[PDB]
Design a protein around this ligand. Structure first.
Ligand code: QAO
Ligand code: QAO
Lengths: 305, 305
């Protein structure tokens, strides 16, 4: 019993983190095979971060200008290129600790573990959701850039996120491992709007299923509803519309609990319209939307990697 | 910016987890040097868990009855003993991945990372506090026993917790690595009272400092108070008494923020007496007490290991 925001075990990702230095800028890189991946803003100086011409900046740089360090071991750079917003540094040595891995572009509302790093060394590990507005609410200081987000499936690490920036609002923006930003963000120090964020409805419902599995039942009501009627209420409270695909994905939790998805939708409506009345669910006084239905099933049947 | 419940990176602990089997019971063990540590209830059968005589049960067992497996590699058991509630299995091989490590008995209100395991394999990693009543609010299924709690200081892992049991209430009890239970708990299937839990006041105050550092300031009031007066209010809301040692430990956060500790105490009193009025602090609609003042300082200056 119990339900917690659990990260993946970070050991396999720890073995790939390196430090990348170019001039005076130091940030984190990801060493897979004989390639090191890092944010291209490593080549930027303080005077060019307002409007960097990355193609012109990268031209003033050669392989020897990139200092890559894995622990105390200095790697030798034999090639550099730019892919979208990431730099790929070809090194003379294949990482002996390279795990089985893919690059994945995650969809909004999916979750992943962040290994926050400084100077190529790990600080800590937390579970995150890609918000509908393609930001994350993380914990990231100066130097955390190049820290990565991942999921694990048995032995394969699926990298989905590289940390690039903090917006003036205090939320976090980054790219996939091909260097394409999630959302409309660019890698320069200019004001950027994340836009209206919404609550991941399917995830809140997964969490209400988690709650019932663990004996929090007080919010279960005698009412049912319709996708259309529920969705009229979703839009009012800035919740993502619920679709039959969402309903289909909750099916295991429905089947487990014998609570029909639309009956949980009616429970959720009463909470949105009435609040929690100073009560709590799984230790929160708010509705939690950072657990996918896969995250509930994983946690509740004790899936190992 | 941002503030999150961050666990330590789990790589060094992953390399020490093994599976321990005795008869039909399988649980997790911790392989350090040539010793494997596990809950002694590994020797118990379903018919003896209500009132195990551990000394009599262990007598019916020999080294060959203990099956220890690190990945697919079967370890050879050349000695077994019982220390309090843990079994120590001497194996023929020193763990090649043994990290620099100590055993530590943690104090109530201290925090640590749990690597939840099944069949000697990691599921995930989360940050926990030892509650004042010596329980933890974790996520643990059948088979999670032997999962460990730790803190890291640069390169040294300090193991503080081994998971033993779930109480009928759904909270979690365990031992230090010398097998001494935190709290009054025993390792048998009998009803056991955790007792009244209290809120870790010093930790709530650290978290209010974290909140101010990150720009949540709405709860800051024009009132001050006294340790004695604050403590009159603490006892009413089941909060631990605040002592000058607590005040002393918050000093860095005081000094950083220029908010006197007793001024934060007055802020906290107004919240306890008035509630949050549907507002939120660092994304919670409740007062959070699972960050130590050391956890705030770590997270806010980006300490790596
Ligand atoms: C990267 Cl190691 C880092 O921590 N950055 C960072 C620094 C510079 C740039 S860039 F170079 F790419 F010029 F473009 F600016 C990106 C990221 C910190 C950071 O985000 N600095 C800029 C903050 C800012 C201000 C106004 C408008 C913006 F879009 C951005 C950083 C600090 C904390 C967390 N992550 C990153
Ligand atoms: C250990 Cl792998 C495990 O998951 N246990 C467990 C099983 C047996 C015992 S024992 F053997 F030591 F006999 F003593 F019971 C301890 C722990 C699960 C568990 O706790 N089972 C007993 C539950 C229970 C019921 C009533 C009163 C009690 F004190 C205990 C376990 C399940 C989930 C999380 N942790 C442990």
């Amino acid at each position: 019993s119990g339900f917690r925001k659990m990260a993946f075990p970070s050991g396999k990702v720890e073995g790939c983190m390196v430090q990348v230095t170019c001039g005076t800028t130091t940030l984190n890189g990801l060493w897979l095979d004989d390639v090191v991946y890092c944010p291209r803003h490593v080549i930027c100086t303080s005077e060019d971060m307002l409007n960097p011409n990355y193609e012109d900046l990268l031209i003033r740089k050669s392989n020897h200008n990139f200092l890559v360090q894995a622990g105390n071991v200095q790697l030798r750079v034999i090639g550099h290129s730019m892919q979208n917003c990431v730099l790929k540094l070809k090194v003379d040595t294949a990482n002996p600790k390279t795990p089985k891995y893919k690059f994945v572009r995650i969809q909004p509302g999916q979750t992943f573990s962040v290994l926050a790093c400084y100077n190529g060394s790990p600080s800590g590990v937390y579970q995150c959701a890609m918000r509908p507005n393609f930001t994350i609410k993380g914990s990231f200081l100066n130097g955390s850039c190049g820290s990565v987000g991942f999921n694990i499936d048995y032995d394969c690490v699926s990298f989905c996120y590289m940390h690039h920036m903090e917006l003036p609002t205090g939320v976090h923006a980054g790219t996939d491992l091909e260097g394409n930003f999630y959302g409309p963000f660019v890698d320069r120090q200019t004001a950027q709007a994340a836009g209206t964020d919404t609550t991941i409805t399917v995830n809140v419902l997964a969490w209400l299923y988690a709650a019932v599995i663990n004996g929090d039942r007080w919010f279960l009501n005698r009412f049912t509803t319709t996708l259309n009627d529920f969705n009229l209420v979703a839009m009012k409270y800035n919740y993502e519309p619920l679709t039959q695909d969402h309903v289909d994905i909750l099916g295991p939790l429905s089947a487990q609990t014998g609570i029909a998805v639309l009956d949980m939708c009616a429970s959720l409506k009463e909470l949105l319209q009435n609040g929690m009345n100073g009560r709590t669910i799984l230790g929160s006084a708010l509705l939690e939307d950072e657990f996918t239905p896969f995250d509930v099933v994983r946690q509740c049947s004790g899936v190992t990697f």
